[PDB]
Amino acid sequence: SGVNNTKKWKMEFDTRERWENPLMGWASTADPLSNMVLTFSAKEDAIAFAEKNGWSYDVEEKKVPKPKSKSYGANFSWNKRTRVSTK
Amino acid sequence: KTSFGSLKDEDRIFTNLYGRHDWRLKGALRRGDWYKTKEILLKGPDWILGEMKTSGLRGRGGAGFPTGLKWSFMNKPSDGRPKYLVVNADEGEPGTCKDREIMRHDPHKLVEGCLVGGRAMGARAAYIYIRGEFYNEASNLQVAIREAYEAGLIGKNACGSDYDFDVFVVRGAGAYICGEETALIESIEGKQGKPRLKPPFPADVGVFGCPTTVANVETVAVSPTICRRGGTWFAGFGRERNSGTKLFNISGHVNHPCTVEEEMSVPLKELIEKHAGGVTGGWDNLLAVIPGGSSTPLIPKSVCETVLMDFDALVQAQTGLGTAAVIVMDRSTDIVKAIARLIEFYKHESCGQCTPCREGVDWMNKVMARFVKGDARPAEIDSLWEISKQIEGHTICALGDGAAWPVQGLIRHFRPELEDRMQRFAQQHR
Amino acid sequence: TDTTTYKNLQHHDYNTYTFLDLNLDLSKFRLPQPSSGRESPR
Amino acid sequence: GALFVHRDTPENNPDTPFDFTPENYKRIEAIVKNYPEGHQAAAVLPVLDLAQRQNGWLPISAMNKVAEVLQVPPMRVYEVATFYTMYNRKPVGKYHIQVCTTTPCMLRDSDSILETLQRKLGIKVGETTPDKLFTLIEVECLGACVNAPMVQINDNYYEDLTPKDIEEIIDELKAGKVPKPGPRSGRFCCEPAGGLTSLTEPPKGPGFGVQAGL
Amino acid sequence: ASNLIEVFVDGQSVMVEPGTTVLQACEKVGMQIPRFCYHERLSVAGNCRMCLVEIEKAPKVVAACAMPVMKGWNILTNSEKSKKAREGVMEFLLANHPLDCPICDQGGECDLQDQSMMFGSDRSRFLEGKRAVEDKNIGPLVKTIMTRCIQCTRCIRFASEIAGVDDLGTTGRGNDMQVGTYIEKMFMSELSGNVIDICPVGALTSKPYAFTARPWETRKTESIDVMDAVGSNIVVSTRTGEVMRILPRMHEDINEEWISDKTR
Numbered sequence A: 001s002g003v004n005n006t007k008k009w010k011m012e013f014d015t016r017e018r019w020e021n022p023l024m025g026w027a028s029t030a031d032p033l034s035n036m037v038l039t040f041s042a043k044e045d046a047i048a049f050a051e052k053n054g055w056s057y058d059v060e061e062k063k064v065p066k067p068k069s070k071s072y073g074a075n076f077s078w079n080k081r082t083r084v085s086t087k
Numbered sequence B: 001k002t003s004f005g006s007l008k009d010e011d012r013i014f015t016n017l018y019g020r021h022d023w024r025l026k027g028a029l030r031r032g033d034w035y036k037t038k039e040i041l042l043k044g045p046d047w048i049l050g051e052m053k054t055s056g057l058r059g060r061g062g063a064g065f066p067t068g069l070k071w072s073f074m075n076k077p078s079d080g081r082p083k084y085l086v087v088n089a090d091e092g093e094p095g096t097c098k099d100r101e102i103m104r105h106d107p108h109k110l111v112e113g114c115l116v117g118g119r120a121m122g123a124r125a126a127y128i129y130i131r132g133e134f135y136n137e138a139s140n141l142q143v144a145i146r147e148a149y150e151a152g153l154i155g156k157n158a159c160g161s162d163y164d165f166d167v168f169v170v171r172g173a174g175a176y177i178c179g180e181e182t183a184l185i186e187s188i189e190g191k192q193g194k195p196r197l198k199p200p201f202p203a204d205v206g207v208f209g210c211p212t213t214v215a216n217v218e219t220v221a222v223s224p225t226i227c228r229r230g231g232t233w234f235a236g237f238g239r240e241r242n243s244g245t246k247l248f249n250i251s252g253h254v255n256h257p258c259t260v261e262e263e264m265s266v267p268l269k270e271l272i273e274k275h276a277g278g279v280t281g282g283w284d285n286l287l288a289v290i291p292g293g294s295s296t297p298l299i300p301k302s303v304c305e306t307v308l309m310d311f312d313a314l315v316q317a318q319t320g321l322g323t324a325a326v327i328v329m330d331r332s333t334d335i336v337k338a339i340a341r342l343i344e345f346y347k348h349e350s351c352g353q354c355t356p357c358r359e360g361v362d363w364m365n366k367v368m369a370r371f372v373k374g375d376a377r378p379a380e381i382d383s384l385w386e387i388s389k390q391i392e393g394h395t396i397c398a399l400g401d402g403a404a405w406p407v408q409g410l411i412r413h414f415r416p417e418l419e420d421r422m423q424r425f426a427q428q429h430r
Numbered sequence C: 001t002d003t004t005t006y007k008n009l010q011h012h013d014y015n016t017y018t019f020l021d022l023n024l025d026l027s028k029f030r031l032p033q034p035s036s037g038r039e040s041p042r
Numbered sequence D: 001g002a003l004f005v006h007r008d009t010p011e012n013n014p015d016t017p018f019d020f021t022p023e024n025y026k027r028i029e030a031i032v033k034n035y036p037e038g039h040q041a042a043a044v045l046p047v048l049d050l051a052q053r054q055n056g057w058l059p060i061s062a063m064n065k066v067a068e069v070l071q072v073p074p075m076r077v078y079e080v081a082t083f084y085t086m087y088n089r090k091p092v093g094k095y096h097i098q099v100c101t102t103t104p105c106m107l108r109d110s111d112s113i114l115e116t117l118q119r120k121l122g123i124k125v126g127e128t129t130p131d132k133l134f135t136l137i138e139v140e141c142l143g144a145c146v147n148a149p150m151v152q153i154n155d156n157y158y159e160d161l162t163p164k165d166i167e168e169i170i171d172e173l174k175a176g177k178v179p180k181p182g183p184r185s186g187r188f189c190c191e192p193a194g195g196l197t198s199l200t201e202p203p204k205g206p207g208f209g210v211q212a213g214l
Numbered sequence E: 001a002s003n004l005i006e007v008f009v010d011g012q013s014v015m016v017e018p019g020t021t022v023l024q025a026c027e028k029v030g031m032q033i034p035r036f037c038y039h040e041r042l043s044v045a046g047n048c049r050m051c052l053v054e055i056e057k058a059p060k061v062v063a064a065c066a067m068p069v070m071k072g073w074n075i076l077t078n079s080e081k082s083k084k085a086r087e088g089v090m091e092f093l094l095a096n097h098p099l100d101c102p103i104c105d106q107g108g109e110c111d112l113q114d115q116s117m118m119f120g121s122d123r124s125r126f127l128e129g130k131r132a133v134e135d136k137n138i139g140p141l142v143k144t145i146m147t148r149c150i151q152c153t154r155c156i157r158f159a160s161e162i163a164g165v166d167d168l169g170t171t172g173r174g175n176d177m178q179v180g181t182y183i184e185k186m187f188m189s190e191l192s193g194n195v196i197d198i199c200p201v202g203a204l205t206s207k208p209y210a211f212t213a214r215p216w217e218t219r220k221t222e223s224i225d226v227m228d229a230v231g232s233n234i235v236v237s238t239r240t241g242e243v244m245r246i247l248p249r250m251h252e253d254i255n256e257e258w259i260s261d262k263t264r
């Protein structure tokens, strides 16, 4: 339930091929930018870095949780359907 | 007045406490119940609330919150919802039998008090949640309610005052936590006896989601006598802010354990040596007293010498006036065993809804059992104090407080007894 | 006017259905109940 | 001691024959009419208590029958039946002796009462006699503390007990008579022993001490 | 400021609507109050007592998940009383919590472990024996190890409100109160892996995912589900080039916090 990992913008790369090692069965790779994750304080900063380094980018906006009307007294309503049957 | 006690029988409210007269409608009418209650209901809600406020009656349930203000919390226009008065007849707390006595011996006082409180707050019904073990008491209450319904005091014309009121009796099924306000409301609503948080208060969202007020049986039953005799007389009895009469259940190591009606602010020594016949073996043989039921901590004989039976007096004595249940323990008492039995009672009666009470009261029960056996080291005394302080004030209801308080009282007063037991155990193993 | 004898002996001859029989007798004396507008909270 | 997990046994499967009598159905209707409309789920406790009073104990078929009568979830019925301690989810004897062992009863020596019951019935606490006549359990405070020590047998309170008194009560129950409730120490109720310290004079009567203007 | 009230979190002023809880005001400011039983899409329960915070000039700490801010309240979230309350509540949870962390599917995904490290004490005073609860068999999807359960009623509230089955609940009282089904009942509706999601402890784990991987080693890929035409946003958890798990993504306009059982 923690939200400390949803504070900073991240840039990652597209996933490339990971095959199986014939000797041990390990995950072998051929691209170097597989574990490359970059941290930014702003979407515009990530945009500037991506355009500066010449990489084509796909950007999705920050999904924030919608504000919710939480009421403890709704669990014990006279007529509404929000009354709970257990606790 | 500076000395309190010696209450007169002409001023005692529960005149049939001992069941020596008829408990039915004829006996209640002879004793003075249901007199001018139509005039009371016609004088209406604001006058009754003012009478309760000027009487200064506090809750007999435990907390003692001012009854006039608590009942005036529902002095609001209706928002399309019905309003309910609820009577807490559970009486789960140990040491207490007064509600049982007045239900089985003066039930018409309870019914008239339900009518008076329901009119004073504005209400269509009073639900009396009785303890499930009180089957004969519930049947006597239903007989009295049937008598009132046949006489026309209740139902579709409240004594001819053009007020509609219904009194229901609903039985529990064996839970001490169902004596709590919100857990009692849930138990009436048909779920488990788990207390709900505040806010919302029962004066806004209560039983079935209506405005409601849970009140003690003693409070409800002394309401119409307060209305008839005036609030000035009830306030004149007792001290300032601790007024009126009170039912004391004296039990334990006394010669005559009994339920008595006495004026408030009475000395504990005077009360015991007058009504209980004294401590078995004498006042010098007295060791400790739990003065307000098991929720309140214990007090030793040295402070029992001059202590009074007020809310404020016991607060100054680092205790409280709960259900006025005076449990007396002499020198022969195993004090640690008694307190551990109380903690075991709280372990069995906690509803387990919320983590501090659930886990910590189980923890205190285990630690108290090891303390009775002597099976620990004396740092665990301070550890148990810290555990009790963690439980107290962090729980949903006050059962966590009422379980942390006896441990705190035992650690505060009888700590050398604990340490002596613990070192005796250590030396008889090593 | 007797004060020396117990007078709760009516609780001695109570059976296991006394409370609910009294409730069933009392059901005819009561007012109609309020409705929440729903037959159940579901 | 008890477990709050149901196990399917031939005597407690959800096919044991339970059904309310027509009188019990009338009582259920009275309870539902006592509660407000749209809140018939509040009638779980009285209907379950009525089922227990009809059947003795409370089998899972009876609990499901209560659920389907009240149109409430069977899990809500199970929650109530497992939360509340007066509901017998296992068969009990004809007489269910409950000895209170909370602190004031312990001070007034309920331990001797428990020991004498154990020696008289030949059983330990929590178990039933082989003739299915007596179940003996320990309980918390039953609300009659000034009459300690005390037991509850079915719906009756037997108070101010001595070992001889509880032996006489057990003998009367074995013979099949009613032992009559109340204290056995000679006092009628919670009054002080050896005379009354209060309420000695007759009550004043109606219209005494009434304030003016009422 | 029409129909708005000013409150303070650590002295910082913030406008809130009436009915806003203390926890909601704190997360509006930007601090996440610790929680175990509160879920923003479930009903308010208020039982774990982990969201206890101190209001200024108030002697009793209040539960932020249920108490609404009144007016001008200064919520001292990082006060001594709040820290002591959090330490005590975590001590009470871990007193009877079982030492099952290496054999737990909730290895690095444990809210209990993380909130222990962030707010609880670093040692135990529990010298007694821990309780143990027998396990259940509610289905081949959700594996139940109920000894780890901390009785937060999140699964019960989810099944009552969102799944709409009314099958789970608490049986018993006190320390013996057990979450589950009283009878041997198989809890299989759709949207039934979300109890595995919202169970903070590893009491309700995924049986296909049982003993397979760890959250720190699983890589997260944000993708879309194609099992139906809802288009639920998901995370594919892949370790060493193999798809290991499917989790939901928070998208308030499509699937909120949950995915179907077929999707999962």
Ligand SMILES: Cc1cc2nc3c(=O)[nH]c(=O)nc-3n(C[C@H](O)[C@H](O)[C@H](O)COP(=O)(O)O)c2cc1C
Residues within 6 Å of the ligand: B058, B059, B060, B061, B062, B063, B064, B065, B067, B070, B088, B089, B090, B091, B092, B093, B176, B177, B178, B179, B180, B181, B214, B215, B216, B217, B219, B397, B398, B399, B402
């Ligand atoms: C665990 C617990 C048990 C209680 N049991 C009772 C009880 O059996 N009877 C009672 O009248 N009050 C009981 N109370 C106190 C109630 O809160 C109180 O009686 C109720 O709010 C009515 O208030 P009053 O004292 O003004 O009438 C209990 C409180 C707690 C915390």
Ligand code: SF4
Residues within 6 Å of the ligand: B177, B194, B195, B349, B350, B351, B352, B353, B354, B355, B357, B358, B395, B396, B397, B398, B399, B400
């Ligand atoms: S304090 Fe104890 S009895 Fe009260 S709600 Fe919490 S668990 Fe239940």
Ligand code: SF4
Residues within 6 Å of the ligand: E097, E098, E099, E100, E101, E102, E104, E105, E106, E107, E110, E112, E113, E148, E200, E201, E202, E203
């Ligand atoms: S739920 Fe968390 S604290 Fe409990 S055993 Fe699993 S990892 Fe450990």
Ligand code: SF4
Residues within 6 Å of the ligand: E148, E149, E150, E151, E152, E153, E154, E155, E156, E179, E198, E199, E200, E201, E203, E204
């Ligand atoms: S099983 Fe999990 S979600 Fe359910 S009450 Fe227990 S800890 Fe909470």
Ligand code: FES
Residues within 6 Å of the ligand: B094, B095, B096, D100, D101, D102, D103, D104, D105, D140, D141, D142, D143, D144, D145, D148, D150
């Ligand atoms: S303590 Fe035994 S009846 Fe109350």
Ligand code: FES
Residues within 6 Å of the ligand: E034, E035, E036, E037, E038, E045, E046, E047, E048, E049, E050, E051, E052, E063, E064, E065, E066
């Ligand atoms: S998060 Fe508020 S008490 Fe659980």
Ligand SMILES: [K+]
Residues within 6 Å of the ligand: E106, E195, E196, E197, E198, E199, E200, E201, E202, E203, E204, E205
């Ligand atoms: K989980």
